[PDB]
Amino acid sequence: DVNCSNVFQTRAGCLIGAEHVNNSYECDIPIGAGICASYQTSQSIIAYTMSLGAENSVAYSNNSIAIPTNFTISVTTEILPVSMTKTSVDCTMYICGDSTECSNLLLQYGSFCT
Amino acid sequence: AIPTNFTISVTTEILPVSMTKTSVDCTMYICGDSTECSNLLLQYGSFCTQLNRALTGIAVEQDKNTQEVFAQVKQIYKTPPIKDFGGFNFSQILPDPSKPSKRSFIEDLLFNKVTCAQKFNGLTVLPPLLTDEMIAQYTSALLAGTITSGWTFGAGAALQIPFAMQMAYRFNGIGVTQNVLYENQKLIANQFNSAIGKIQDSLSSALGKLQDVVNQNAQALNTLVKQLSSNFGAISSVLNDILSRLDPPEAEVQIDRLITGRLQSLQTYVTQQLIRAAEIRASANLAATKMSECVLGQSKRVDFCGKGYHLMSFPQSAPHGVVFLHVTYVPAQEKNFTTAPAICHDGKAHFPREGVFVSNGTHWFVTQRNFYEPQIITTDNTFVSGNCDVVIGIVNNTVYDPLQPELD
Amino acid sequence: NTLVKQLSSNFGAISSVLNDILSRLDPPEAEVQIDRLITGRLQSLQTYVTQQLIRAAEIRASANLAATKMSECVLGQSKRVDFCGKGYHLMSFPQSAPHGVVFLHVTYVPAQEKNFTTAPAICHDGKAHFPREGVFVSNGTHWFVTQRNFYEPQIITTDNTFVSGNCDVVIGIVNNTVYDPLQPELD
Amino acid sequence: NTLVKQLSSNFGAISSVLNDILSRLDPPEAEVQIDRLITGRLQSLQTYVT
């Protein structure tokens, strides 16, 4: 929230230390309002508007169809976690330890430990 | 009962995707312009760091959910310049050139229905990533891909296909043949236009699902602001007044109690925000699954992409959400006829392939499980598999053979 | 690391070690500090347990999703688009992973494509011959029938199609003579 | 059952009955004990609601 070297005012705020270029590439380090910075071309930190990929038009007609001829086989991967490590936290060992008055005073908070 | 009439209906489903991105400060909310307060709060800096890390985690989780929801294809498609689809009319779902954004009329109508003071106490708003223009362009590209292909772009290369053949292929997925569409195309087009008009008139004066979250967030912010005026067992809610009228030796306990109360309030608010973020994540996962299993390709899951036989879907954008418009074919008027298991002609038990035998009261015809199509039972539509003494309830009826007159 | 670091803070006291406080002060003057330390440690443990419960709920949801995907992709062929990979799902090969599972789906995806003039149906002597499960294409003059997954031109016969009404019902329908292999078999 | 048994805890006091404390001590002295009891019960209720 600052009104504005290489100072540039974007819809996300104000960036100091990057020159805005005219070319648009893929998103890397996002900032906000559709802005992503990276480290490209001698090479320094520059700011540019992220692109939404390739833009192509499909030839639509009333008497045409695209029948595939050659086919390929591709294998994809997927990483999904299942479980994690089981951690146990002892109440007395973490609160008191080798004391007596502490253990006697902790008797009034045994329900929380349970 | 065999249905004879049908009516195309369009449903509407509202599902949230993301919510607001808020960030709460520790020193600005607890202390401010003081020294002893900061010295006492430095002992509880671990809690502040944990809360800031949780806020950053919620912020990046919202961005990840938005990226997973509003991203299905990698190529931006445009609408064809020729407005011809075979009787149908697609003019309300396309972005109007009069508006500066890439939103259509339905999107602008639904956006108007949804309705620095908070930043003074350290409650700032983080700038979102996916802007409205990018979401509108993504929705337009998805609509163009669906009207120029349907499901071929969602699994590989884009295959061109007319809208009539696409509609016929979608109707063939539920058992309905192509003659029903090639003979009653104008009726289906008029029914679809009437359904679109009814939906457009109903959406114009509802959207409480995209508003209850904002209302709860505003109420939580107001509660957090009002909690700064409470005493928490003291005499006032101003640290400067306490430091002026009372000495630090007699105000340290009060400052500690205030800090503890504010830390408990911040912990409760962070827990509520985590619960809301988990709910938003679940809703976004559900919306992404519905987008992948309804719009991209036609699925056979009963009651998942609408109420009835799902044909095609039109994805629409929404502020902090998404609008789904499915095509639910539902049968209407039906009649009453009599059925028959198999046919017993010359001892062989003829069973139909995929049709059903009906009779108006005298003659016996064979039709399908959808539309009433009276046909003549031939040798190519039925198969033999045994005798008539093993089938229970089989009647006696002759079987026509068109091969005999062709040989004479 | 956070639980380890939550042991040196004073929480409004003069020390963080219980043995240090009990060795310099008497219980009647250190009971309040002991109670404050116990309350702070209980609050820290409650926050940690809440975080662990949230993480356990997230792990439960992830495990349920992974088991559903496993049972729907490996133990069967599901027609759910964009669920068992990107393309037409064939089979899968589950693998082992520490605290996880690695998936190896098989996604048949078409590659090359061409352009051909398609037709909805073929009219003969006043009857529309709709295909049972194919599509009529042309290459300049002749007309063949192909499937929806491979370019296989076939001779327009009779048993491969079915009649339904006349030809004056289709907007854009062409005309082509049916070969009909039943006629040469009778000659 | 845990919420019911929480009413028997002392949370660093001398008893758990409010009337017993109000009848044995003057109001301008049991305020800290009442505040501690209220804080403990509010923490227990917050954990239960979570």
D2 interfaces chain A, CB cutoff of 8 Å: yes
Q: Does any CB of chain A come closer than 8 Å to the CB of residue C99?
A: yes
**Which secondary structure element, helix H or strand E, spans residue D46, and what is its range?**
helix D31-49
Residue C81, both tokens: 């688009």
Task: Mention every residue, 6+ apart, whose C-beta is less than 8 A from residue B8.
Answer: B188, B191, B192, B195, B327, B329
What's phi and psi for B130, nearest 5 deg? Answer: -70, 110
Residue A111 touches partner D, C-beta closer than 8 Å: yes
Asked if B74 has any chain A CB less than 8 Å from its own CB, the reply is yes
> Three-state DSSP class for A43?
coil
CA D6, CA C187: separation in Å to the nearest integer?
Answer: 101
Q: Do B138 and A52 touch (CB under 8 A)?
A: yes
Phi and psi, residue B240, nearest 5°: -65, -40
Exposure on the CB side of residue B375, measured as CA atoms within 13 A: 20
Q: Give the chain B residue whose CA is nearest to the CA of C50.
A: B271
CB pairs under 8 A between B and D: 5
Structure tokens at B322: 């998404």
Residues B281 and B275: their CA atoms lie apart, in Å, by: 10
What is the rounded distance in angstroms from the CA atom of residue B147 to the CA atom of residue B139? 12
Option in D35, D43, D50 nearest B271 (CB): D50
Residue of B nearest to C159 (CA): B380
Cα–Cα nearest to B68, from B291, B316, B298: B291
Q: What is the 3-state secondary structure (H, E, C) of chain B?
A: CCECCEEEEECCEEEECCCCCEEECCHHHHCCCCCHHHHHHHHHHHHHHHHHHHHHHHHHHHHHHHHHHCCCCCEECCCCCCCCCCCCCCCCCCCCCCCCCCCCHHHHHHHHHCCCCHHHHCEEECCCCCCHHHHHHHHHHHHHHHHHCCCCCCCCCCCCCCHHHHHHHHHHCCCCCCHHHHHCHHHHHHHHHHHHHHHHHHHCCCCCCCCHHHHHHHHHHHHHHHHHHCCCCCCCCCHHHHHHHCCHHHHHHHHHHHHHHHHHHHHHHHHHHHHHHHHHHHHHHHHHHHHHHHHCCCCCCCCCCCCCEEEEEEEEEECCEEEEEEEEEEECCECCCEECCCEECCCCEEEECCCEEEECCCCEEEECCCCCCCECCCCCCEEECCCCCCCCCCEECCCCCCHHHHHC
Mutate to test the interface with C, among A60, A78, A86, A102 (most CBs of C within 10 A): A78
- Cα separations (Å) of B308 from B62, B305, B345, B408? 33, 8, 39, 50
- The nearest CA of chain D is from the CA of C68 a distance in Å of 29
- The values of phi and psi at residue C95, to 5°, are -130, 165
| Helix (H) / strand (E) containing A29 | strand A29-30
Terminal CA-CA length for chain B: 40
Q: Which amino acid is at D29?
A: E
Q: Which of A52, A74, A78 best tests the B interface by mutation, with the highest count of B CBs <10 A?
A: A52
- Range 105-134 of C in CB contact (< 8 A) with B: 107, 109-111, 113, 115, 118, 120-121, 128, 130
DSSP letter at C169? T
Q: Please count the residue pairs, one from chain C and one from chain D, whose beta carbons lie less than 8 angstroms apart.
A: 5
List Cβ neighbours of A106 (8 Å cut-off, separation of 6 or more). A91, A92, A95, A96, A113, C38
CB-CB under 8 Å, B50 with C2: yes
| Measured torsion, CA atoms of residues C153, C156, C159, C162, in degrees rounded to the nearest 10 | 110
Token pair of B5, please? 């009439």
| B138 phi/psi in degrees, rounded to 5 | -65, -45
Three-state DSSP state, D43: helix
Q: Which chains border C (3 or more CB–CB pairs < 8 Å)?
A: A, B, D
> In chain A, which residues have their Cβ closer than 8 Å to the Cβ of C104?
75-77
Interchain contact A33–C (C-beta under 8 A): no
Indicate the DSSP class of residue D38: H
Side-chain half-sphere exposure of A23, counting CA atoms within 13 A: 5
Phi, psi for residue A92 in degrees, rounded to 5:
-65, -45
| Amino acid, res. B133 | E
Query: CB distance A11–B76 less than 8 Å?
Result: no
* Distance of alpha carbon C138 from alpha carbon C136, whole angstroms: 7
Query: How far does Cα C42 stand from its chain's mean position?
Result: 43
| Interface with chain D: mutation pick from A104, A106, A111, highest number of D CBs within 10 Å | A111
Neighbours of B360 (CB within 10 A): 12
Rounded to whole angstroms, how far apart are CA atoms B13 and B7?
Answer: 20
**End-to-end C-alpha distance for chain D, whole angstroms:** 17
Distance from CA of C125 to the nearest CA of A (A): 23
**Residues in a beta bridge with B22:** B125
Q: Which of B20, B39, B21, B22 is nearest to B30 (CA)?
A: B39
Are the CB atoms for C167 and C127 separated by under 8 Å?
A: yes
Q: Please report how many Cα atoms fall inside a 13 Å half-sphere around the Cα of residue B106, on the Cβ side.
A: 26
Chain C CB contacts of D43 under 8 Å are: 43, 46
How far apart CA B236 and CA B164 sit, in angstroms, is: 74
Q: How far is A80 from chain D (nearest CA, A)?
A: 28
How far apart are the CA of C23 and the nearest CA of chain B, in angstroms?
Answer: 23
Question: Which run of H or E residues covers position A73?
Answer: strand A71-81
- Cross-chain Cβ contact C18/A102 below 8 Å: yes
CB A105 to CB D9 under 8 A?
no
Q: B295-308 burial by CB neighbour count: b if 16+ within 10 A, else e?
A: bbbbbeeeeebbeb
Residue written as token pair 């440690």: C41
Q: Are residues A51 and A24 in contact, defined by beta-carbon separation less than 8 angstroms?
A: yes
Q: Does D35 touch chain B (CB under 8 A)?
A: yes
Are the CB atoms for A32 and A50 separated by under 8 Å?
no
Distances (CA, A) of B322 to B106, B291, B339, B377: 12, 10, 46, 50
| Closest Cβ–Cβ partner in D5, D12, D47 for A108 | D12
Data resolution in angstroms: 3.8
What is the rounded CA–CA span in Å between residue C94 and residue C96? 7
Q: How far is CA C67 from the centre of its chain?
A: 13
- CA dist B143 and C159 (Å) reads 38
* Residue B189: both structure tokens together: 């087009």
Report the distance separating Cα D11 and Cα A107, nearest Å: 10
Q: Is D20 on the interface with B (CB under 8 A)?
A: no
> Whose CA is closest to B292, among C79, C72, A71, C66?
C79
CB-facing half-sphere around the CA of B4: CA atoms within 13 A = 9
Distance from C-alpha of C99 to C-alpha of A80, rounded to nearest angstrom:
9
Question: How far is residue C140 CA from its own chain's centroid?
Answer: 41
**Quick one: how far is CA B41 from the chain centroid?**
46
Residues in chain B with CB shorter than 8 Å from the CB of D43 are 264
One-letter-per-residue 3-state SS of C39-83? HHHHHHHHHHHHHHHHHHHHHHHHHHHHHHHHHHHCCCCCCCCCC
DSSP SS3 for C99: coil
Any chain C CB within 8 A of the CB of B39? no
What is the distance, to the nearest Å, from the Cα of residue B378 to the centroid of all Cα atoms in its chain? Answer: 46
Chain D touched by C46 (CB under 8 Å): yes
A52 min Cα distance to partner chain C (Å): 20
DSSP A51: P
Which residues of chain D lie closer than 8 angstroms to C43, CB-CB?
43
State which H helix or E strand residue D9 sits in.
Answer: none
- Name subunits touching D (3+ CB pairs < 8 A): A, B, C
Helix residue ranges, H only, chain C: 2-5, 18-24, 27-73, 182-186
- Asked if A68 and B124 come within 8 Å (Cβ–Cβ), the reply is no
Q: Report phi then psi at B234, rounded to 5.
A: -105, -160
Gaps in chain B with C–N over 2.5 Å, residue before each? 115, 205
Pairing of strands A44-49, A35-40: antiparallel
Residue B97, judged by CB atoms within 10 A of its CB (0-12, 13-18, 19+), counts as: exposed
Residues 6+ apart with CB under 8 A from B123: B22, B23, B24, B25, B29, B221, B224, B225
Residues in chain A: 114
Minimal Cα distance from D44: which residue of C? C46
Backbone angles phi, psi at C96, to 5 degrees: -90, 155
d(CA B137, CA B112) in angstroms, rounded, equals: 19
Mutate to test the interface with C, among D37, D38, D48, D50 (most CBs of C within 10 A): D50
CB–CB of B329/B6 below 8 Å? yes
Note whether A73 contacts C106, CB cutoff 8 Å.
yes
Q: What is the DSSP letter of A19?
A: -
Q: Would an 8 Å CB–CB cutoff place D15 in contact with chain A?
A: no
Q: Quick check: B76 and A34 CB within 8 A?
A: no
Main-chain phi, psi angles of B88, to 5 degrees = -75, 165
d(CA B366, CA B373): 7
Interchain CB contact of C11 with B (< 8 Å)? yes
Q: Which positions in chain D touch C50 (Cβ < 8 Å)?
A: 50
Chain C residues 115-134 with a CB less than 8 Å from chain A: 115-119
Comparing C-alpha atoms, which of A32, C54, A13, A4 is closest to residue B21?
Answer: A32
- B312-334: b or e for each residue (b if 16 or more CB lie within 10 Å)? bbbbbbbbbbbbbbbbbbebeee
CA-nearest residue of chain D to A109? D11
Give the Cα separation of C122 and C143 in Å (integer): 9
Cα–Cα distance measured from residue B319 to residue B101, given in angstroms and rounded to the nearest whole number: 14
**Cβ-contact B224, B123 below 8 angstroms:** yes
Q: What is the DSSP letter of C93?
A: -
Take residue C129 and report the two structure tokens written for it. 């011959």
